[PDB]
């Protein structure tokens, strides 16, 4: 009956045994899960995660690799990974409420488990890249007429050989496309799981796997990441009017951003697309250095990228004098979890801050303006950005806030599925260094010998809403930016143009 933002709610989100054996558990999803889990969107793969890893065969000449035996090895690794992190076999259902239900069932038998793992690993002798396959799958989705949600995870192994029993040559590449329903993970969890598989598969290269100790299915249930609410350092019962007002500030900015000036888009819905700019290690190191020197401690290339996003937008437009750039921006919420949970959490764990930049005219610069003017503008924007974040990040309730406001947003989106009209303010997503989660090599564990070099990583998300989302990460000291967009709403040329503008501004910051 009250008009107030609904409260959390913890008991609602806990794991519940659904039958007498204890083998099946379920929970009502929470926070950002409820956004990605929105039924008509999840059924159509909105926000599905794709991780494209290009790998090179650097194994001893005496190591024999084929797509068939790699499939076999990754199946074994995936069974090990399901035991460690059962998120990879959770499934989704809905009733009449907005939030999805997440279910885990322990395999009914070891045979059943192997059928499962077999069904998640695919191969193709093909010259297509991982991201060519992504495009193929998204182009196909349409006509296929099925609104089945994606599996928690599946793998596609590609290599340009004639057949699946052709030895993969020295120095040849194997591409892996990982594909995940975003419901079961965030970008941190999914990357950590990719890293786990690259670790676990190392046990199976060069070998008698049928003789290894049987997996005692059932014993992995305790391995599911615990419910996020119950995992916070903060007792959420202790919250009062400060928490309510801050949540209100967020939901107000959310609606303000949805209704605000931004990039013009054309209405419609067609295919998810991505444009990528891989900066060199040399360029990226230079930019990181220029951030350290010019701005110093507590500033990062992520702040710089957000600043460049803003400058590129202002340079693109030909805004009211009093416009404020306001942008809800997501943050990894793990620091708000208890220490012995926080570094081993695979489920969605996200919250958010509101980036605010006033005085936009004063930072409006062209690529042709004096370098020092551009640097100044970038500096001023970075300082505004860092300051904005601090106001959210310094707050001990920030993760609880994220859960509560994303519950509201799922409900808001359920009633208004496309919340932008005419224009949409670009969104920034900051992921950090992939080395935290993924190894540079897959090694034969028994020997320590390198078998496959992990040469490239590209984190691609399905976009079916009409805003640009810009994602930054890093691998082997090279920063990568990509922009996801739906091709009903924007052209490739115009998103390429905008990404190039962003990159050009960041390059301009170098010493
Ligand atoms: O010249 C260094 C710089 O430019 C690169 C060269 O590889 O250019 C990339 O830019 C576009 C983005 O539109 C990519 O799609 C293209 O494949 C790349 O050549 C980039 O890596 C370096 O930063
Ligand atoms: C500003 C904010 O917090 O947004 C939310 C965080 C996020 C997890 C996600 C960021 O990772 C999903 C991927 C994309 C494209 C955009 C973002 O949209 C909302 C989300 C789905 O729940």
From Swiss-Prot:
The keyword Transferase applies. It is an enzyme of class 2 (transferase). Gene3D superfamilies: Chloramphenicol acetyltransferase-like domain (3.30.559.10), Nonribosomal peptide synthetase, condensation domain (3.30.559.30). One of its GO terms (molecular function) is acetyltransferase activity. Disruption phenotype: Leads to the accumulation of deacetylated calonectrins. Pathway: Sesquiterpene biosynthesis; trichothecene biosynthesis. Keywords: Transferase. Its EC number is 2.3.2.-. 15-deacetylcalonectrin binds at residue 406. Induction: Expression is positively regulated by the trichothecene cluster-specific transcription activator TRI10. InterPro entries: CAT-like_dom_sf, Tri3/Sat12/Sat16/Mac1. Coiled coil: none annotated. The keyword Transferase applies. Disulfide bonds: none annotated. Belongs to the trichothecene O-acetyltransferase family. 15-O-acetyltransferase; part of the core gene cluster that mediates the biosynthesis of trichothecenes, a very large family of chemically related bicyclic sesquiterpene compounds acting as mycotoxins, including T2-toxin. The biosynthesis of trichothecenes begins with the cyclization of farnesyl diphosphate to trichodiene and is catalyzed by the trichodiene synthase TRI5. Trichodiene undergoes a series of oxygenations catalyzed by the cytochrome P450 monooxygenase TRI4. Trichothecenes are sesquiterpenoid toxins that act by inhibiting protein biosynthesis. This is Trichothecene 15-O-acetyltransferase TRI3. It comes from Fusarium sporotrichioides. The gene is TRI3.
